[PDB]
Write a protein that holds these residues in place. Structure first.
Motif, PDB file in Angstrom:
ATOM      1  N   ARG A   1      -9.760  18.184 -14.686  1.00 14.85           N
ATOM      2  CA  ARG A   1     -10.092  17.822 -16.088  1.00 14.85           C
ATOM      3  C   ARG A   1      -9.012  18.516 -16.912  1.00 14.85           C
ATOM      4  N   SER A   2      -9.206  20.034 -16.900  1.00 13.43           N
ATOM      5  CA  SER A   2      -8.670  20.709 -17.981  1.00 13.43           C
ATOM      6  C   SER A   2      -7.060  20.661 -17.598  1.00 13.43           C
ATOM      7  N   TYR A   3      -6.682  20.549 -16.374  1.00 14.77           N
ATOM      8  CA  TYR A   3      -4.851  20.488 -16.182  1.00 14.77           C
ATOM      9  C   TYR A   3      -4.766  18.650 -16.477  1.00 14.77           C
TER      10      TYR A   3
ATOM     11  N   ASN B   1     -13.776  20.159 -13.203  1.00 13.67           N
ATOM     12  CA  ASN B   1     -13.479  20.353 -14.525  1.00 13.67           C
ATOM     13  C   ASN B   1     -12.104  21.068 -14.438  1.00 13.67           C
TER      14      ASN B   1
ATOM     15  N   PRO C   1      -5.044  26.675 -18.558  1.00 13.20           N
ATOM     16  CA  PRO C   1      -6.404  26.390 -18.612  1.00 13.20           C
ATOM     17  C   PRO C   1      -7.277  27.575 -17.727  1.00 13.20           C
TER      18      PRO C   1
ATOM     19  N   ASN D   1      -5.939  19.886 -21.679  1.00 11.51           N
ATOM     20  CA  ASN D   1      -5.458  21.191 -22.057  1.00 11.51           C
ATOM     21  C   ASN D   1      -4.144  21.660 -21.874  1.00 11.51           C
TER      22      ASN D   1
ATOM     23  N   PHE E   1      -9.887  29.219 -15.274  1.00  8.59           N
ATOM     24  CA  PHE E   1     -10.821  28.603 -14.344  1.00  8.59           C
ATOM     25  C   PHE E   1     -11.348  29.965 -13.317  1.00  8.59           C
TER      26      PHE E   1
END
Lengths: 164, 164, 164, 164, 164, 166, 166, 164, 164, 164
Positions: free
Chosen positions: G111-113, G108, G10, G2, G12
């Motif tokens: 993942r998002s980064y 996650n 993103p 993302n 968190f």
């Protein structure tokens, strides 16, 4: 479904023969002849079946033109038979010179697009089919109005005149 | 479809009344009474219609057990009428003491799951329905074997005995 | 599901044999014989088991007509066995002359369309199957009403009379 | 399906009570108490039922720890009853100090994920549920190996020691 | 699509009026009158347009029966106009006593199910529509065979006789 | 969760900390012919004095003489596992171990055994008994704060093996 | 991934090891009003002497006087992180830290980064500069074996802030 | 899209060569060498192009390390050429020691994930690719902040030290 | 996409103004005036820019006819600017009397359906738009052939003559 | 659809030949020659057909440039023929030196994207196609404005000049 200049919808179904027997009849068995296939709603109607009778009384006029005529309804072959055993005077059919298809599954009526789905009976549809099995003309009447033997013959001669 | 202890499939359809008239009949109009609804394949069959007649000859035996009996087939109301006008001695139906439904659209047969689709005719299905409109027993015979008036009465009495 | 003039739904399942042993039984192993397959709801019911017993007491009458009889319920084979070890006077089953299928998956009941899904038990369904494995008649009773050995025999003779 | 720290799957089902009566039992009716719910495959199995008996003989040990114990199988309540009427010396169950659920629909076994679908019977699953109705531990054994009353008590004390 | 006893497919389209002007005409504007709507393939065909002319020469016979007549083809309104300006002797249309729809998008032909998709022209279809806008009869001819003014009038009188 | 009784136990091939201190890829199928006790725990270095994991390590031989191998697992890396073993047992560490410890870094093993707490990203105290044919034979799952019993697992093992014999 | 330049970085909220040794939930949005250098590393206790993570910790004040907070992250648990800080710096440990370290247990965040190595289950050496508005402003991603430069990140920070002023 | 340790996205595109000619350049033609591929937004930007120039002035430093450097933007090759013909003192580029790709389709920027879709221009992305064509490091700057030649060299030496 | 007698595709984009400034220009800002919007492939082409210049040299002739003229290409506004700063004798554009849109996203070219997708540049498309914003004529040339100022004026007068 | 530098949409359709006969014409039959294909809305329109005539009067000017010219509309071939039989002074077409396609199915207009669907008629589209069958230029006018024979010739010469 039934379309002009497309092969007329196929069928193989039990019919009441002019002699009183039951027999499977296929459309393709008429290849090489013209066919007038015509539907009617119900056997034993309080209508005087003058219309179905009219076509039967006239077979030979169609025959002289290389044309076979075929009746059809959603009634069983036994219903057909019973109607022919019934007196013409008493509203019966009397003898028939043409076969009458017993479209018991209603599929022939369906493929010719003449089935009234809510009633489960066929409209007064009539179809002229050529020796090649091609659908050449469509006539469909609402229940209360009959067709004309003269008119169908008019059409037949016209079609055959064009072929010559 | 027809399931035990579920409401029996609804219908409203033309029937030949015992007096000779045509009348719309709904299943729900029988609420408050037991119903024996039974199907047969075709009118004018070459089987002497002993089975349909047997039930008609016995209505009273059902009637005093607060049970109405109803016949049904895919034949038209006119076909039905014609069969009753035919002499019983001559393989006809003669006078009838029960109504006969004209399941012209085959939907009643379909909903009761007794239709032979290829044939277009119903199997010899019989259904017992209670005053609440609940389906209580299913009998289905292949074409060539008849049902028993005695047996249906046996079942009726048994069911009513369980209610007391 | 089960349909008249279609092959009766297949099964191979453990059954309690008349001798007291467990054995796998397939429907197809009966090919060449008529079969009366009948279901009942539960073993050890407060309902005396006259019905199941009635069929066991009458096997020979069925056998003489080249017909084997087969009972079935959702109970285990051990439940079946225990019921037969129980005294007939005491509400038990006693020695049985017919096999009893242990439909532990309820799939046989399901395929014959007699399973009451909410209860997990079968209705009093009975099915007549011919030597060709074709389903020939359907009887289904609500729980509280029994079937008739006489009636099943009546149908059996009728069916065999039509073949002969 | 059943997950640690999620609400244990709900159920309301008939059970054989310790006094010999049938009664509907819901999981939620145990709210405020610990529950050991445990499944077993079949009643009347040829192998002495020491496991189920072991838990029944030990109820008071669980009750001392504010824990109710509940047995379950796919057998009917009548099957359960019959097994308790059978003599313990003779391979029977004798009268039980715990209720036994009659999971006739198989759905409880399904929701706890212990149903052997091919057999139609449950594995030897045992579930510890807290006063809040939360699933706290899962034990599942293959058919031939039993569970330990001591172990379940070990676990119970451990859980209660943590909440203390 | 066009069906007996269903409302005839709607349309509002430019037409060549008998006076020589262009005008939008809707089917619903004929409500309260019978309508004979008839299609033909193409303007300026080497066919002597005897058929279209025949209907125009006969308007008043239809008018005396409370019936309006309407011609239609896939040709533009300008094409129509040009054909009427052309001599009858030279194969032209001459004066017309009926309007001629210019079905330039072919959608009217499509909705009446008379369009030959490969050619982009309509078959010789004719439709009788009642004062309520209900389609009452269907006639469809293959290209080379004409329809009969007498026949359509036969049908009209028959329909009106039934209504009386 | 793929983990079903009498179905083949979910496959895996993953790095593990060996008893000798080395890293090694270990597959489940490499245990074919032996019983396996596979057991999960949540996290390395927890404030729960790690008696449970140690208890199983101290008892390997007991499992081994039952033809049973024992295998630990968590979502922690192999380096985390090694560090924990280098830490003194007295001081809340693991000490040197007699069993391998899988480093389920992708969390997929925990997932396939249906013991992963998705919100936390850690595994529940799940234990699985697998036979020489690779078939899953028993499932034990404990909530985080309650330990398993070495005795109980051995009870189960002997029971299973007794059924094989007679 | 993302993670897009000029889009909000993103979100968190995750547990982190605080410089004081405590565990605390930290959200990205709690840094609104400050610049943030968020940087990932693969694993705790690696055989790579952890100079890179230490270098950023030793330099916090340099970031801080730029109105920039620095945040470390890995897939390791908060307990793993704490243990590493309790380990002596001389001995390959982390020593006490001046920056929080996120415990991306669910992976996650990584993942998002878009820095997660899916096969390994660990993050690449990704570094992200986020402005006071929460907008992602620069992306640096290194393969495992090569470190980032504290000087370079500061170069970038000053450059970004210079553009704001004039 | 571009991922560390995956093959860097392929391209074959026109570029302005250091000598002033246009030439098709493929990524794979660099196999066996390190590549620094770097993007910039637009030619002729109002801000002195020190960044692109900085890399051109330093090619030999990269070449010393078996590394080729490649510039790229969405501008045409003619735009590139024009910028190099422009005087460096006047805000122009002067003649370059590195090729400049003309990513007219924007697809190279897209595949490297550096395209600002709303603007139609690329961010200041820089990518280090190894002799095997594998992507080894990603740098992406927002428009207003430049990259460091020193830093890229730092990285290059570091990578080569590891492979050594 | 663009269609005759539909509103011409909308746009709001940066353009190089005749005075040398950058400005956002929307199509709708021309409502009340005719617009000649025309595309060209690339700035700085080795093809002398006689065509673009021809339209700029003729603005007044368009203006007198209440028509504004607008140029467009995929090049940046800075590229545009640089081309106008270049001497007309030297293959440059010189001061322009019309705005030049910088279609950096290529979306304007796309919506007008003139984008060569493989090249990333627009064909020599020209569009006449009326005061109501309706697209009235489409001209598209392959790259190597120019349009005619005379012709566009011929069409413009023709269109305005039809309104007056 | 019709795209520059893509093969021009194929067609094979009936056309009115200059001699007055009907003939099937395919686009590919022109391979080796340039083609000017141009559409017009309707035959017999109240606009004096100067535009279609202008192209016919000038065939030779196209012909000596190795270019064939082809007219097209949605009207039938008979409509076309009739228009040519009509006197030019009287608003007719008179003799024609070019073929006129009869796009009766509107598919040619559709594929060239010049069809006004609501109308059913084609816009004044003109297409230049090279000897390789490649579409090289698109002109589309709104109904009320004509094209220029001079302009098309300008374009033709320009295109051919580029080939040498």
């Amino acid at each position: 479904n039934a379309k002009i200049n497309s092969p007329a919808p196929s069928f193989e179904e039990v019919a009441l023969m002019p002699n009183g027997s039951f027999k499977k009849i296929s459309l393709s068995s008429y290849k090489g002849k013209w066919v007038v296939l015509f539907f009617y709603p119900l056997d034993f109607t309080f209508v005087c079946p003058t219309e179905v009778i009219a076509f039967s009384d006239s077979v030979s006029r169609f025959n002289e033109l290389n044309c076979e005529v075929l009746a059809c309804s959603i009634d069983s072959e036994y219903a057909h038979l019973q109607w022919t055993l019934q007196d013409r005077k008493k509203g019966g059919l009397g003898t028939m010179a043409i076969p009458i298809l017993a479209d018991k599954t209603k599929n022939i009526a369906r493929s010719y697009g003449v089935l009234e789905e809510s009633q489960g009976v066929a409209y007064r549809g009539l179809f002229i089919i050529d020796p090649h099995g091609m659908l050449r003309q469509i006539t469909v009447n609402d229940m209360p109005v009959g067709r004309s033997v003269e008119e169908v013959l008019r059409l037949l001669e016209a079609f055959q005149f064009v072929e010559k």
